[PDB]
Design a protein around this nucleic acid. Sequence first.
DNA 1: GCCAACGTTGGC
DNA 2: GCCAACGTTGGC
Length: 51
Amino acid sequence: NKKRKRCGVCVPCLRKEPCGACYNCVNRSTSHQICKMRKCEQLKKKRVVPM
DNA sequence: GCCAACGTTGGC
DNA sequence: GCCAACGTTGGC
Ligand SMILES: [Zn+2]
Ligand SMILES: [Zn+2]
Protein backbone atom coordinates (compact mmCIF):
# COMPACT_ATOMS: atom_id res chain seq x y z
CA ASN A 1 0.00 0.00 0.00
CA LYS A 2 0.79 3.73 -0.24
CA LYS A 3 0.43 6.68 2.07
CA ARG A 4 -2.91 7.12 3.80
CA LYS A 5 -5.25 9.94 3.04
CA ARG A 6 -7.11 12.33 5.32
CA CYS A 7 -10.53 11.20 6.32
CA GLY A 8 -12.27 14.44 5.47
CA VAL A 9 -14.91 14.15 8.23
CA CYS A 10 -13.17 14.70 11.58
CA VAL A 11 -12.96 18.21 13.07
CA PRO A 12 -9.36 18.75 12.04
CA CYS A 13 -10.21 17.71 8.45
CA LEU A 14 -13.16 20.06 8.28
CA ARG A 15 -10.95 23.00 9.49
CA LYS A 16 -10.81 25.76 6.79
CA GLU A 17 -7.52 27.62 7.69
CA PRO A 18 -4.18 26.80 9.42
CA CYS A 19 -4.20 27.89 13.11
CA GLY A 20 -1.09 30.03 12.73
CA ALA A 21 0.24 29.40 16.27
CA CYS A 22 1.34 25.72 16.56
CA TYR A 23 4.88 24.51 16.06
CA ASN A 24 4.14 23.51 12.42
CA CYS A 25 2.49 26.72 11.37
CA VAL A 26 5.35 28.88 12.76
CA ASN A 27 8.05 26.54 11.35
CA ARG A 28 6.34 25.47 8.11
CA SER A 29 9.72 25.06 6.26
CA THR A 30 11.70 22.66 8.61
CA SER A 31 8.80 20.44 9.91
CA HIS A 32 7.03 19.36 6.60
CA GLN A 33 4.00 18.82 8.78
CA ILE A 34 0.37 19.91 8.56
CA CYS A 35 -0.99 22.33 11.20
CA LYS A 36 -1.54 20.40 14.44
CA MET A 37 -5.17 21.62 14.45
CA ARG A 38 -5.64 20.21 10.89
CA LYS A 39 -4.08 16.80 11.41
CA CYS A 40 -6.60 14.05 10.73
CA GLU A 41 -7.68 12.15 13.76
CA GLN A 42 -7.42 8.92 11.72
CA LEU A 43 -3.85 9.60 10.62
CA LYS A 44 -2.64 10.13 14.15
CA LYS A 45 -3.19 6.37 14.53
CA LYS A 46 -0.19 4.20 13.38
CA ARG A 47 -0.60 2.13 10.17
CA VAL A 48 -2.37 -1.23 10.18
CA VAL A 49 0.35 -2.33 7.67
CA PRO A 50 3.75 -0.76 6.71
CA MET A 51 4.48 0.42 3.12
C1' DG B 1 9.46 19.32 -11.19
C1' DC B 2 6.71 21.56 -7.52
C1' DC B 3 4.41 21.29 -3.15
C1' DA B 4 1.53 19.65 0.74
C1' DA B 5 2.04 16.61 4.00
C1' DC B 6 2.58 11.19 5.39
C1' DG B 7 5.95 7.66 7.31
C1' DT B 8 9.50 6.62 10.00
C1' DT B 9 13.17 7.50 13.16
C1' DG B 10 15.35 8.80 16.91
C1' DG B 11 16.26 12.28 20.70
C1' DC B 12 14.12 13.55 24.57
C1' DG C 1 4.93 8.24 24.64
C1' DC C 2 5.72 12.80 22.49
C1' DC C 3 7.24 15.37 18.83
C1' DA C 4 10.52 17.54 15.38
C1' DA C 5 13.48 16.42 11.36
C1' DC C 6 14.22 14.27 7.12
C1' DG C 7 13.16 11.71 3.00
C1' DT C 8 9.67 10.76 0.44
C1' DT C 9 5.57 10.69 -2.96
C1' DG C 10 0.69 11.36 -4.80
C1' DG C 11 -1.55 14.66 -7.25
C1' DC C 12 -1.07 18.25 -9.90
ZN1 LIG D 1 -1.23 25.38 13.31
ZN1 LIG E 1 -9.81 13.38 9.38
